[PDB]
Structures are given as structure tokens and as C-alpha cells.
Scaffold this active site. Structure first.
Site, PDB file in Angstrom:
ATOM      1  N   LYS A   1      50.932  45.582  19.112  1.00 41.67           N
ATOM      2  CA  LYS A   1      49.799  46.143  18.399  1.00 41.67           C
ATOM      3  C   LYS A   1      49.537  45.350  17.090  1.00 41.67           C
ATOM      4  CE  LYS A   1      49.927  49.607  21.436  1.00 41.67           C
ATOM      5  NZ  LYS A   1      50.733  49.683  22.607  1.00 41.67           N
TER       6      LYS A   1
ATOM      7  N   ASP B   1      62.555  53.040  16.323  1.00 44.16           N
ATOM      8  CA  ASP B   1      61.533  52.410  17.152  1.00 44.16           C
ATOM      9  C   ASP B   1      60.331  52.127  16.242  1.00 44.16           C
ATOM     10  OD1 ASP B   1      59.448  51.738  18.880  1.00 44.16           O
ATOM     11  OD2 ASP B   1      60.077  53.150  20.432  1.00 44.16           O
TER      12      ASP B   1
ATOM     13  N   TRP C   1      56.841  59.023  23.167  1.00 44.96           N
ATOM     14  CA  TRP C   1      56.295  58.143  24.183  1.00 44.96           C
ATOM     15  C   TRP C   1      57.077  58.450  25.453  1.00 44.96           C
ATOM     16  CZ3 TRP C   1      58.374  52.704  25.214  1.00 44.96           C
ATOM     17  CH2 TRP C   1      57.466  51.954  25.956  1.00 44.96           C
TER      18      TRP C   1
HETATM   19  C1  LIG Z   1      56.848  54.399  20.269  1.00 42.81           C
HETATM   20  C2  LIG Z   1      56.685  53.164  21.101  1.00 42.81           C
HETATM   21  N1  LIG Z   1      57.780  52.383  21.395  1.00 42.81           N
HETATM   22  C3  LIG Z   1      57.630  51.157  21.963  1.00 42.81           C
HETATM   23  C4  LIG Z   1      56.463  50.856  22.639  1.00 42.81           C
HETATM   24  C5  LIG Z   1      56.458  49.702  23.634  1.00 42.81           C
HETATM   25  O1  LIG Z   1      55.919  48.539  23.015  1.00 42.81           O
HETATM   26  P1  LIG Z   1      55.696  47.207  23.879  1.00 42.81           P
HETATM   27  O2  LIG Z   1      54.369  47.300  24.562  1.00 42.81           O
HETATM   28  O3  LIG Z   1      55.788  46.084  22.881  1.00 42.81           O
HETATM   29  O4  LIG Z   1      56.754  47.087  24.950  1.00 42.81           O
HETATM   30  C6  LIG Z   1      55.327  51.631  22.371  1.00 42.81           C
HETATM   31  C7  LIG Z   1      53.980  51.161  22.849  1.00 42.81           C
HETATM   32  N2  LIG Z   1      53.531  50.124  21.913  1.00 42.81           N
HETATM   33  C8  LIG Z   1      55.441  52.795  21.600  1.00 42.81           C
HETATM   34  O5  LIG Z   1      54.349  53.545  21.288  1.00 42.81           O
HETATM   35  C1  LIG Z   2      50.827  50.719  23.464  1.00 36.32           C
HETATM   36  C2  LIG Z   2      51.235  50.591  24.757  1.00 36.32           C
HETATM   37  O1  LIG Z   2      51.287  51.928  25.340  1.00 36.32           O
HETATM   38  C3  LIG Z   2      50.945  52.774  24.412  1.00 36.32           C
HETATM   39  C4  LIG Z   2      51.053  54.194  24.909  1.00 36.32           C
HETATM   40  O2  LIG Z   2      50.965  55.180  24.153  1.00 36.32           O
HETATM   41  O3  LIG Z   2      51.341  54.382  26.122  1.00 36.32           O
HETATM   42  C5  LIG Z   2      50.661  52.080  23.243  1.00 36.32           C
END
Ligand SMILES: Cc1ncc(COP(=O)(O)O)c(CN)c1O
Ligand SMILES: *c1coc(C(=O)O)c1
Ligand SMILES: Cc1ncc(COP(=O)(O)O)c(CN)c1O
Ligand SMILES: *c1coc(C(=O)O)c1
EC number: 2.6.1.1
Lengths: 396, 396
Positions: free
Chosen positions: B246, B211, B130
Site C-alpha cells: 500500500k 503487523d 484481517w
Molecule cells: C493487516 C494486514 N496484514 C498484512 C497484509 C498483507 O499485505 P501484503 O499484500 O503485502 O501481503 C494486509 C493487506 N495489506 C493487511 O491488511
Molecule cells: C490489501 C490487500 O488486502 C487487503 C484486504 O483487506 O483484504 C488490503
């Protein structure tokens, strides 16, 4: 990795809260609280807030992410509260607002933004201030220096000492101002003193950072913003960190804003893109529920009217307690001037008690204040005022 | 102060979202989305969530601040999800959890905690990952180094290249692992590969940072935590940043957790006091609404059952789309192997399309993916599958 980490300092307030809870005396009174409490000792959810939450439960069809800067309507209502409807800053599109997790979140975003994108190395904070100010700025790698503020003899603003302290600030330093209801003292500049500070700040090249956590708790929404507006009339650039935790009773929903102002639209938009980058690298985007409640209320004539009255009720109860406290101390034989309490603004004042008097109050009488002698006047009620004042008199 | 600030890079995803919105073709399909979408193209509020929100509207009597680490029940339910009910880590009180504003918030808290209180200077992240991982760690002053992960020929985990890359990591570096549903590839270690990595990490002195943003999206809640649990069985210390954005459809309410594990109770408590200090200096305390919804659901047999089924429905729809996508490409004459799509886990996969094929797909066919070729299979529906696949075939 973790075997040798030194524990963080305790942590009064929680230490204070815990001692208060453990205390088995009848009897006991907690003036060390941080929140508003009504005449019954409760911190209820505001009626305007419950109504808004019901509307959101009925009408929300997704929890899809907000933009990095949060709900547009929240940003617009926030800028109107800060600057006034029809403000040139708004008309000229010189201001950009990010919805943040509380006032603290807004301060940290401002700090990370400044540390990463500007030459700022130093933030000037009043002595005294909210203790977390230092922690926030230091966390972003910024030095914190103190400026004189409190006259411990007259219980007033030492304006000469303030100005003299601030002459040590260099062009390009940030100076932090509490917009109204200075914490912990309740001592605010007069409008003329604000105007003098606004002119000095322009001449000295300071970047003003307003911390506005209590809008509506001193005199009223518009009046509480006079100081900020005096600065905004004079400055090309400033930052405002505001909070809706106290004036909406929305503490735990983390509802605040960081508002960036620059000379023009092009400049603020460019600078704000980096503020958004600082947000993205921190908590990604802000929590919807609390801010949506705020936007729902502020943008609806009926809900806004109910909320404005609930806020007025809080401001008025606080002022009534200040008056009752001074009257009751006089009546219980304090025989010294506490009149300063009437003129101070918001929930907090220094009582003028020493650290040892405070410790005595807690140990002998089960009356709890912060070690500095700061009291939350919203912890006072008509029913607890007499024993509270009897205890205070006993330690004088 | 702000006159010379350079704008932050745009910002695809929003750039992508904006192009998608502007596109006037019938016709158009967005696979660049970050969220789950159901068969109708909506991201609704889960029924379990609406039910919980109704209960909170009826039952909350205050918005008074949570503790710095948030709701106790949230922390307990989180640790059970991560480690399993009856885990030794839980029994031995080796784990402490802070509720945070989302997974991103949990990552930033972990990063600030490590930067301030340990000798950590470097975090190892998979190539690819990410994109926000780098931004978060760098913001806390930590260097990010990449380890090999993706085999672009077999569309599998290049396990040998991974291990070889990681030999460059020094004792005391952090290594970041995606718990399940690797983003962007959907490629996860097998349990045996997790076990091999757990043993290597112990021998090399790495601090594991998991993560965990997609628990429940690969095979199921317990199975998705196998890898983490393999590490937890072997390590004295680790950190888990998890997210409920999610798996509860709670994106905008910012619901996550940072879980700190140390050798024993005394050590974790001492280390956690500094994690709380890092939180206090950032956003003070976390947003209640989303986490309260999560705790309400997880701690109630009826709501938990409804939620578990809703999550199963999401996991199953994603897997059905992976299957339909492979079948339809074959049927539309792709004439190359896309079987890798069936074996990948979660919403995201690399399609194997080049950056230019992706640009062509958008310009000529109104099919939108990320420039890397990552697609969100939850943007696929039985109704849009045929034209989607016809377009893809046309650019091969
Ligand atoms: C690997 C990863 N880490 C963390 C996040 C950040 O999650 P959030 O939207 O809860 O901040 C994401 C996006 N869901 C992600 O894909
Ligand atoms: C959930 C929020 O962002 C994602 C991404 O892949 O950027 C998933
Ligand atoms: C001066 C000051 N600044 C900001 C804050 C932090 O506000 P919040 O709880 O919204 O983070 C407070 C406490 N309300 C404060 O007194
Ligand atoms: C609101 C939250 O904290 C306070 C304080 O003075 O610490 C007010």
C-alpha cells in the site's frame, strides 16, 4: 523466547563463496557457483529480458495484485512448454498452473498442498539430490526417503539399484523426479528408462512430482520434456514444479510454477482451489515482474526467438566446456577416463574427486568445488581451463 | 490421490469482484476493494516507482540471487522506518531484517520460525482482524485465539474488554498488534493506550508481533510508528511484519519485511540464522524488483521526497473522503451520527451497516461492501459520493 535457540548449520555455498572472496591468490577459480556464467565470468541479464523489461516499464499502468495463481498467460505458456502445444492434458483442461516465487516456491506449495489435503506422508528423493529438497518437504511435515541413483564406479545411472530402492515405496508415496539435468550429477534417464519408470509408477501407485529447473539445458526445450511427457501420457495425476531462474537468467526475480494435473477438469479445479488456499496462507499472491517478463517473451514471436537463441547459447557453451574439460585433462596428463563428463547434461557433474582432493584443490590451488566434488562447468572458460586442469591433475 | 479433496471455501472479495463486474447497472460502486484508488478510480504506479524502475532497467547488470535475507540497503531503510534513525535497537545491532514476498510472506516466515524454533503454540489476534491472519498462523501449525477490540455501540476501541480478554493469554503466547490503520476497523490505540499495552505485555510475558501494513496512512511515517516504538523501548524481543504493498503502490511485486529483535547482537544473529533457514525451505530467497525499487527510493534524497509526497497525497485523499462521506450522509438525511468515520485511520472502516443492509445495498443499489459492512473509503470519490450516500440512507 529466543535466548536458547540453536544456530542453523552453516550453510556452505555462502561459506564457500566467502572463502573464495577472501582468497588472495591470482589464480583462483570458483566451480562451486550455482548460476550460469558466460565466457567472461558474468551472469548478465538476457537481452530478451531487458527488452521485455523496457516494454513493461512503458506499458504497465498499475501494480494491482495478481490473482493467487498469477498471470493467466504465464500459466498457459508454462503448460505448453511442459506438455507440448496440442497436448491432451491441455485440451482436456486437466492441468492448472500457479505462478510461484521460483522453483523452490513451487516445491513448497506442492508440499503444503499435499500435506494438508491428501494422505501423503513421504517423498522419495534420489541419492544424491539438491540438498534443499529435504528441507522443503520436511518443513511441510513430510518425511523424505532416498532412492539409489548414482553409480560411483561407472559415473552412470544405476537403473537396477533405482528400481530396487523404489520397491520400498508404498502406494500413495510421492516420488520426485528431476525432469532433465539432474542436480548434482547431470545424469538423466534415457527416454526408454523414463517409459519404464512411468509404467512402474502407475503399477505401484506413486504420485509423480517432477522438478523441472533446467528445461532447455540438456538437449533442447522439447527434448528435455520427453520424460515428463512419457509420465503425463500414463498418469491421471501428477505435479510439476518448474523454474525459470536458469533458462531466463531470472534468478532473483523468483519465477517458477506449480502445475497440478488430475484425471479431469472437475477434479483438478477442486484440488487446485486448495492449492490456492495453501498459497494464500503463505505469500498471498506471486511477484509480477519476473513472471510478466517470461509471459511477455514466450507470447511474442520476436522476443521468443531471441530468448530461444540465448538459451541455446547457454546450452552450447556448457557442452563446449564439458568437451574442453575432458580434452584438457587428457592433455595435462590425467591419464584416466573422464569421458562421462561429455555425456552428462546441464551445469553440474560430480568430478569423481574425493572430499579430501576437493579440500586440497582449495587449500593448495585456489580451485573451489562443493565438498561432494560437484563442479559447475559454467565456471570454466577457455582461459581458465589449463590451470584448472593442471591443479586437478596434481591432486589425482 | 485427488479424487476426494474438498474444495476450498469461496473466497469472497473475488466472489464480490466477480459480482461487481457482472452488474450492468450504470451506477455501481465498489467499496469492497482492497487497494488504494485515486480520485479517478485508478491504482496507478507511483511516479517515484516508475523513476526507480527506469534507473534499475538502466543500471542492473545481473539477476543473480539475492542473499536469503534480501537486499542489505532495503533492510537498513526498513529498520530506520520502523525504529527511527538513531534508535538504540539499531545502534546495539539488536534487529535483523529479512526482505520477504509481501507482508503476508513476512507473517508466514515469522510463524514458521516461531513454530519450529520456540515453544510458541498460540497467537492472539483482535476480533475483528484481517481474515488471512488465522489462515497464515494455522498453516504453520499455530492456534489462533481472539481478543476483544471493537465496541459496536460507540464504534471505538473497547480498551477494557481488550485487556480483560488478554488476561487469558499465557506467558509465551504471541500477541498480534496492528501497528496503525487497524484492518478492518481503522481504530488504533492512542499513544497512552500503546504505552499501557507495552507495560502489560512485559509483565505478562507476551511476545509482541506487530503487523505494519499501512505505515504513513494514519498520520505520517514517524507518528504511525509511535506504538511500535513504545513496545520496542520496553521489550527485549519482538517481531515486525511490515509491508510496502500500500504505501508504495507495489502490491503485485510482493515487497515486505520480517524484522526480528532480540536482547542483543549475539542472540538476534543466532535466532535470525533459523529465520533464514525457514525462508530457505519456503521460497529460497526473495523477489528483487519491488524491494530494489523501495531501497532505491528510500536511499535517495530526491526520490524519497517525491515518494513521501505521493504517500501524503494518498493519506490526505483518504481523510478527505472520510470527511466528505460524513458530511454527505448528514446532507442526504441519514440523521444519525457517523462522526466516528472522521476519527478512524486508513482505508477501512465498519460502516455500522448490518449484513442484510449490505446485501440490500448490492442487490437494490449496486453498491458493494464486504458482508461485515467494511468499506474502503478510497473507493469513494467526490463524483460518486452523492449516489453512494443516497443508497446508504435508503437502507437505514
Ligand atoms: C493487516 C494486514 N496484514 C498484512 C497484509 C498483507 O499485505 P501484503 O499484500 O503485502 O501481503 C494486509 C493487506 N495489506 C493487511 O491488511
Ligand atoms: C490489501 C490487500 O488486502 C487487503 C484486504 O483487506 O483484504 C488490503
Ligand atoms: C533441482 C532443483 N530444484 C529447484 C531449484 C530451485 O530453483 P529456484 O532458484 O527457482 O527456486 C533448483 C535450483 N535452480 C534445483 O537445482
Ligand atoms: C541454482 C540455484 O542453486 C543451485 C544449486 O545447485 O544450489 C542452482
Amino acid at each position: 523466547m529466543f535466548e536458547n535457540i540453536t544456530a542453523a548449520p552453516a550453510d556452505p555455498i555462502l561459506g564457500l563463496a566467502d572463502l573464495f572472496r577472501a582468497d588472495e591468490r591470482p589464480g583462483k577459480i570458483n566451480l562451486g557457483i550455482g548460476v550460469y556464467k558466460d565466457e567472461t565470468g558474468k551472469t548478465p541479464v538476457l537481452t530478451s529480458v531487458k527488452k521485455a523489461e523496457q516494454y513493461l516499464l512503458e506499458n504497465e499502468t498499475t501494480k494491482n495484485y495478481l490473482g493467487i495463481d498469477g498471470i493467466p498467460e504465464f500459466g498457459r505458456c508454462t503448460q505448453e512448454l511442459l506438455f507440448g502445444k496440442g497436448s491432451a492434458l491441455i485440451n482436456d483442461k486437466r492441468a492448472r498452473t500457479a505462478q510461484t516465487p521460483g522453483g523452490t516456491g513451487a516445491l513448497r506449495v506442492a508440499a503444503d498442498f499435499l500435506a494438508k489435503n491428501t494422505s501423503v506422508k513421504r517423498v522419495w528423493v534420489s541419492n544424491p539430490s539438491w540438498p534443499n529438497h529435504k528441507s522443503v518437504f520436511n518443513s511441510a511435515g513430510l518425511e523424505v526417503r532416498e532412492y539409489a541413483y548414482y553409480d560411483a564406479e561407472n559415473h552412470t545411472l544405476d537403473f537396477d539399484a533405482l528400481i530396487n530402492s523404489l520397491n520400498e515405496a508404498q502406494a500413495g508415496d510421492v516420488v520426485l523426479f528431476h525432469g532433465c539435468c539432474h542436480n548434482p550429477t547431470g545424469i538423466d534417464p534415457t527416454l526408454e528408462q523414463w517409459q519404464t519408470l512411468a509404467q512402474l509408477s502407475v503399477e505401484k501407485g506413486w504420485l509423480p512430482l517432477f522438478d523441472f529447473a533446467y528445461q532447455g539445458f540438456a538437449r533442447g526445450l522439447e527434448e528435455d520434456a520427453e520424460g515428463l511427457r512419457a509420465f503425463a501420457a500414463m498418469h491421471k495425476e501428477l505435479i510439476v514444479a518448474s523454474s525459470y531462474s536458469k533458462n531466463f537468467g531470472l534468478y532473483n526475480e523468483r519465477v517458477g510454477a506449480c502445475t497440478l494435473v488430475a484425471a479431469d477438469s472437475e477434479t483438478v479445479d477442486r484440488a487446485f482451489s486448495q492449492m490456492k488456499a495453501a498459497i494464500r496462507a503463505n505469500y498471498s499472491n506471486p511477484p509480477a515482474h519476473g513472471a510478466s517478463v517470461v509471459a511477455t517473451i514466450l507470447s511474442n514471436d520476436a522476443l521468443r526467438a531471441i530468448w530461444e537463441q540465448e538459451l541455446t547459447d547457454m546450452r552450447q557453451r556448457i557442452q563446449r566446456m564439458r568437451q574442453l574439460f575432458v580434452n584438457t585433462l587428457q592433455e595435462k596428463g590425467a591419464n584416466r577416463d573422464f569421458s562421462f563428463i561429455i555425456k552428462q547434461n546441464g551445469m553440474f557433474s560430480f568430478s569423481g574427486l574425493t572430499k579430501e582432493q576437493v579440500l586440497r584443490l582449495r587449500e593448495e590451488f585456489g580451485v573451489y568445488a562443493v565438498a561432494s566434488g560437484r563442479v559447475n562447468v559454467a565456471g570454466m572458460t577457455p582461459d581458465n581451463m589449463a590451470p584448472l586442469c593442471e591443479a586437478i591433475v596434481a591432486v589425482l
